[model samples]
Target: WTDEQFKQLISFKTQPGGWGVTDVHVRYANSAKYTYNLPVLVSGTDDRLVSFSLRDDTLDILNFEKFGNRPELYFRELPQKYYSFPKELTIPAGQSHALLPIEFSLDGLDDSQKWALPLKVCEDNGTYAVNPRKYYRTAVLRPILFNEFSGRFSGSSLLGTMAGESDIKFSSTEIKLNVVTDSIVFFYAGQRTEDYEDRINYKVFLQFTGDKVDSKKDLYKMKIWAENEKLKFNSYSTPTYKVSSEMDATKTYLKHTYIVISDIDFDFVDYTSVPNYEIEYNMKGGLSVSRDLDTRKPDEDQGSDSKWW
Candidate 1:
């Protein structure tokens, strides 16, 4: 996350095009469990605020006292409803305003518990929320450690000829960022490979640019390899292999896959950047995840109130 100063603007350059501002409303019930904090991001300002409020129904539920003379509902029932009211502040020409405060409320029968709300402020203009995941592709070496072989040749010294070859082997390794839709940015450190007696390394870097192919026909794959500085051995002896490949959408549920070979390891010291789309939308609108307080807590028990009526 960048500093608060960096997130004051709400434009196409900062957020994608086609996204517009919408009124933000927040409310919470007294019985609801709000464990998260609320964060609000606004335009033309660097400072963000964390806040919200309670509605009438929420107040009524919380008003219940404990003991018989006190509020019986307070001790007998659980608090379960919450709401938020977030409004967008329209700025006049050459002027600015802070984001509106969120609202809260209550709805459970007992209403003794209170929840903390969790909120995040982002200058997102896209239809879906932005969440970035990391991915890696490279090669590595698995040393042979041991190898032995024997062969026979015809008409050789009235006897037989023997030869053997063995040493470190190469394989692909991969670290995937599952469900990468909006974007994936990462560094490509380098690659490595090993032969019977010699080791070789190379500097490699690449950026993958593409969107999720909803269709099942298209296939995406990436591979990399390197060889010793001296060409004493056959190219087949020092072969390059495929690092990773994307599965067909029709055949697999997973969206993406990555393969890194055994000879290479990404350098934590080096810095590289790759961008991938993690979220996409055909239309424009605000995307928010909110929970309705009413559904959280219903009026399931009336107890003594039933006898009085």
Candidate 2:
């Protein structure tokens, strides 16, 4: 179904592979572009170890228009010279493969380079030609798994102006909302004495729960409150927003960034209008996640936008 001129071919295919490309993906004892990257070849019918040999017309590179009278960009090819088969190969996604032989060894090739040999399978017992799909199949010979990059994240500080004006003492902190697969809520408490009266305590609570008031659609809830010292003057939210932030390449410590926004509702005053709260948040972070929270596949999933083409 990968071939562009699919309607003409019986059922389309992701025609052919070459030296180094990869696609959707596979595993143990599988084809490396189309030849066995394995020790034994099992005969589908006999169910025994099979022995086979490569024929001459194996290595080839056809064009993208190799099919149909009005071909849609695929063609056929052949191996120019006799070369040993590669144990592995890397081919582009949706492209089929050209097969090679197994008897050929990849003796001195370094770990950096990759190779793929053409394939044309047959039973060593001479009972079958193994072309269930009519021609040949390919496999990726030398393959490597890439490093996973979860990418960067950012959140902001909640105790901005309010904490500074109240004589409260607190360690610098980064309110990490929208953390990774693992994150938690934090309640930082600070204390200060005002004019030698009873000590006053303040609490900066970063609640990771959903908001019941305001924007409940928001994932992390936040508040700044006094420990009963100010009775009704409990918690307050201030103007906070996400700002430019970063992470370490190798992750020695938890890398952090700041969004620089907060929602303190109580400590406001000398009022003119309402606070500047942006109503529109793409939260591509969540839209990218798209569902009820299984965030792992957003990018590749959004990849289609998706007609996963």
Candidate 3:
């Protein structure tokens, strides 16, 4: 009777609990200091202190591969000087979580390259077990870095002029400017498709070449260029940048305009086609962008409202 009654319970070996860390994402602002709490997990009830350190030597490339291996999303390991954390952290006796604070210094950072900070939890000091699984043991902190020049712009005013053809007028629509450096940004060339596989070939870079045009108004000399020779992106005249501001009852309005006087010429190739044909066009006029910001947030009262921008 005892054997039959006890048979209802299946016999199994007990497994020890483990400790580890997980991945985290951050939007790094150009501030003096920024802090992010990396949560540490524990599977047992006893209070446990865990040791961890940054693994800058090798990036968790596999994690980047999970996001379709986008070149723009590729990561370089973050330098150690910009960040710091405690060597040891502890989880409360009955709690399943603790936080490891990482402080990052982001002012005057060289943002030409994107970055990632890799970390790992070390083995327990002989009392508890550590999770051997790669995802559990390693933590990858990915920061979406950006500068003032990256954001959406209005492309309505741009005029595309083709050789011996009628001019192409673009509708009032949104244009994106991707951050390339501290002061440089890029967008797709005239009439080229955006975000396609070969779209990068048609990149047109814009940067401030000189000081402000007006003392009160946010205006400057802009330089436009392209690296891809296939693009044949050359300008026949000077480019200009202007940022005007206005204030309503509650929101502050900013109007940014980038104008290329005379001809802004470029070429686009259709690589997907069997024969791979090329098309040529010239662009003129300007690209205008406007943004309305919340008047209350004085710290981020200029440019974009998003931290990523």
Query: How would you order the candidates by TM-score, starting with the best?
Result: 3, 2, 1
Q: Provide C-alpha RMSD values for all models, in order.
A: 27.6, 22.1, 9.4
> Please, what is the whole-model Cα lDDT of each candidate in the order they appear?
0.22, 0.27, 0.54
Give lDDT: candidate 3, residue 153. Answer: 66
TM-score of each candidate structure, all chains considered together: 0.18, 0.21, 0.57
Best by TM-score: 3
Query: Which candidate wins on lDDT?
Result: 3
Give the RMSD in angstroms, all C-alphas superposed, for model 2.
22.1
Candidate 1 Cα deviation (angstroms), residue 73: 23
lDDT of 3 by residue, 1-309 (tens): 233333221111112122111223223333545577766665433555677877654354443544456655456677788788898866667776678788876554444444667776754442212223322555666544445545666666666656446567343365666665556667776545433546667678888555766777666777788888777666766577755555664333433233332223433333332355655666666765555555555432243443234
Whole-structure CA lDDT of model 3: 0.54
lDDT of 1 by residue, 153-245 (tens): 011111111112122122224211111111211111121211101111122222222332234533222222223222111111111112233
Residue range with the least summed lDDT across 10 consecutive positions in model 3: 10-19
Badly placed stretches (over 4 Å) of model 3 are: 1-47, 51-88, 91-99, 102-141, 159-164, 167-172, 190-194, 209-218, 251-274, 295-309
